Design a protein around this nucleic acid. Structure first.
Ligand code: MN
Ligand code: MN
Ligand code: MN
Ligand code: MN
Lengths: 87, 105, 95, 94, 95, 103, 78, 96
DNA sequence: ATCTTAGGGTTAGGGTTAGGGTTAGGGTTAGGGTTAGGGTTAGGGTTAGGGTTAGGGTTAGGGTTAGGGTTAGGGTTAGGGTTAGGGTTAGGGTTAGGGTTAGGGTTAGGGTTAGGGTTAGGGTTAGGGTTAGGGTTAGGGTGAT
DNA sequence: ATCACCCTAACCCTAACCCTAACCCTAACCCTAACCCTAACCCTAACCCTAACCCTAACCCTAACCCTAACCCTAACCCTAACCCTAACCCTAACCCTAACCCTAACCCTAACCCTAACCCTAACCCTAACCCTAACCCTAAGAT
């Protein structure tokens, strides 16, 4: 009823072992140590660009809840068309 | 045959496709055979996908096609891959492939 | 004690041959709400919308790893470096 | 409440024709539904443009067919243009 | 023969406002005409989709608004959303 | 004219007709062609501005497609906006890699 | 006629791209890549011409095909 | 007599700072009509349609050269090789 | 090259979750009557294409020289793989509560429907500035004493 | 560097041709008008998202030895760069032929719209079979003896 806890530095929640797993799926054998930060940078950019458009859809719909459709329409705008979450 | 789909030898809904073409703002008018041609093209493509997916499901000893089977069918076909090249199948994973230089000597 | 390569090659097969997500759902949901907060406050996220974002991210990053690895192999290497991620993004038209 | 449209009835019908023993996941059916919708608007939108370009007010099966020839790959388009002209031909007779 | 529409009259008027001691090539005017037509379609089509997603049957300046925010880069969109809301505001005043 | 009513050079009446003719939606709001003609007019002015400057730099008075390309690719936003667009007769921005420079 | 796109004409296009050294195998690979590009564009351009019931491929058909390919061309009355 | 890679640097500036086409109009027009005949016979081409195709081609190839050169430099080189054009078109989403 | 050892591939049936069969029901597709405007014939204007002549001269092309880039191979650190252990929070199924989306009822103004009125801009013509083209020049590095 | 070597930009010459100023009339936009419904308002339902409790063992993080991929010099090799001069061929400059595009005139017939209509198909429910999970199971191949 009264407060929202401060959200801060959650790009570190995308751990080095979680980044390692995504490299394995891409067929990566050796992973430099500098990569874990560069990946965090690139992931943050991707998320900003998608969520920014998703929210622009939510705001246009006069809603406070970002729906699965908004994220889908945003992905299609970015040319990263997603199958499975409606539409 | 009372439904338009039965008159055309289709499973896909000829009546629904005709309604979506008008209700989707594509043109002023929708020809009589356009929803028929389109429902058939969509029905053909879904059958072409379902075919290769059921095959990937049978290879994996499964009865039911899950999104992995759909991805395996898409990326293993040359044309389906080109058609859905800039598309992401959720829960699809990747095709298993390891580059030759990364292999033990 | 396995040689350097043997566990890496086992992991690649383990994950390529699988479809489960590779980032934990809660740290990722925090990151999403943090980023969204910085565009508009008082925002709610459908459970599905977050999963739609997570699927999108991982699929992107894995595909980015694919191109990155091809860039390391191009410069006679086996290990992915920032210069490779940068070249893969330069050529992809992300710059 | 609101009603949610779907191509699940037809994806099921078509699945039984091709693999009568094979089933389908709820997620996989979602992927199939997204596929049908994506290709519907890809073809419809391209046909919408062809009509506009040739100062035509109507989308006829002739616009659907050239949209298919433009959008689908070589041997998929050939078989789709075939399967399509057949359904139209059959529809005109009955 | 047929009638050939063009935005040349307005590209000239607007050129005269920014650079009155500057002219334009016949080829460069074609490039400007292609630019106006491309951006017209880009915005109109995006607004057509927004109208549709929200089960609405009308493209209003609110649909043009959000299409501009989606299509135009960061500062360009800020200034376009400004000049747009400006022109609408002014239009409402004068009948 | 509706353009004079909105303080515009771009045709508010024409844009309104193209919106219903182009099959975008059933109805077109009163302020949508006004907002759009203004956004198009703003962007043309933003381009023409940087293009006249590039023409001024090259000692010319008349902006040719080279001046338009130079204006587009030298901006960060105009380049991102027209990233997957080709200006005919535009040529490239002069740029030579640092490693391909004399030792 | 793919050999009409000479080795010196290919070298000029490499210079604009900021290319210092050009391998000899390149001149053939470029010819391959150019042929693929032309096939894909002309194929769609002709599909537009054929839909319009015409025998002459117009500048607009080449423009519409380029836009379909994601290589949108400015200046040809598009 | 200029050193190896000095006339090359002069040529790069000569062409980058220019806009004229780099393929002769007739050999190109022959290639276009040859390719088009292999899709449909009895074809005419508007003068403008051919130029639209030529502009499109060169602009594409120059941009391809840009990425190709970046690939040669990535693998500690100065000369563009087929492996570079292939890596450029592969990551561009033209080749797998 | 033999021999231990830790990997996934496998089998088992436990056992849960899920899909597909099933009901009835709510809305959408189909029917068949009238409607008008896109489109389709028709002829027949006419624009714009390809055809085929010609004269250099710009440019392509083989074959001269050495230059230095690509490549190989060997040796050098040191960087990221792999092991273990102690946290360390992610993930499980809980629980409640109200901010939020939204059916569904009601009214009004916005927008389209019409046309006939002015008025803007397409289509043309044409004189004259801006670019073009050819020369000799200062300007600035290139390659080698 | 210091010396000659090329070349390309810098000015000022005069010419080709296209901007853009011009006129006129066409068709497009604009202010009369009724007229219907989409969107706005207001409600409440009702889900659903948020945050709240609970425990845990999955999964992370941190540092430890060192295996080996990365990157260094250098040395061998020839790939292609520069320079040239014979020569093919692209390029304007020029003409007519007439197939191809498209004007716009008559007239038919397609796709629209309409209400009542029945029939699919959405959804809500239910069981049993696919598949999920963890128990050992041998096989296999990693990598020291
Ligand atoms: Mn914040
Ligand atoms: Mn290290
Ligand atoms: Mn409440
Ligand atoms: Mn009818």
């Amino acid at each position: 009823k009264r407060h929202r806890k401060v959200l801060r530095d959650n790009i570190q929640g995308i751990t080095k072992p979680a980044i390692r797993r995504l490299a394995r799926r891409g067929g990566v054998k050796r992973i430099s140590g500098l990569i874990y930060e560069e990946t965090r940078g690139v992931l943050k950019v991707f998320l900003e660009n998608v969520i920014r458009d998703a929210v622009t859809y939510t705001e246009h719909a006069k809603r406070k809840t970002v729906t699965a459709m908004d994220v889908v329409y945003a992905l299609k705008r970015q040319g990263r068309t997603l199958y499975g979450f409606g539409g | 045959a009372k439904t338009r789909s039965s008159r055309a030898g289709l499973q896909f809904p000829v009546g629904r496709v005709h309604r979506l073409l008008r209700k989707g703002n594509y043109s002023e008018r929708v020809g009589a055979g356009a929803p028929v041609y389109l429902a058939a093209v969509l029905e053909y493509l879904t059958a072409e996908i379902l075919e290769l997916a059921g095959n990937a499901a049978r290879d994996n000893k499964k009865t039911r096609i899950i999104p992995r089977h759909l991805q395996l069918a898409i990326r293993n076909d040359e044309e389906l891959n080109k058609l859905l090249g800039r598309v992401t199948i959720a829960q699809g994973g990747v095709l298993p492939n390891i580059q030759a230089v990364l292999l033990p000597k | 004690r396995y040689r350097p390569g043997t566990v890496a090659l086992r992991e690649i097969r383990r994950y390529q041959k699988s479809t489960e997500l590779l980032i934990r759902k809660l740290p990722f949901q925090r990151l999403v709400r943090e980023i969204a907060q910085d565009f508009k406050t008082d925002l709610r996220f459908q459970s599905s919308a977050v999963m739609a974002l997570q699927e999108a991210c991982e699929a992107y990053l894995v595909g980015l790893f694919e191109d990155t690895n091809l860039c390391a192999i191009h410069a006679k290497r086996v290990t992915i470096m920032p210069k490779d991620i940068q070249l893969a993004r330069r050529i992809r038209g992300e710059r | 409440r609101s009603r949610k449209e779907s191509y699940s009835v037809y994806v099921y019908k078509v699945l039984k024709q091709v693999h009568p023993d094979t089933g389908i996941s709820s997620k996989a059916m979602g992927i199939m539904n997204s596929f049908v919708n994506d290709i519907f608007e890809r073809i419809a939108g391209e046909a919408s443009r062809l009509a506009h370009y040739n100062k035509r007010s109507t989308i006829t099966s002739r616009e659907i067919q050239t949209a298919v020839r433009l959008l689908l790959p070589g041997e998929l388009a050939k078989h789709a243009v075939s399967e399509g002209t057949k359904a139209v031909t059959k529809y005109t007779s009955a």
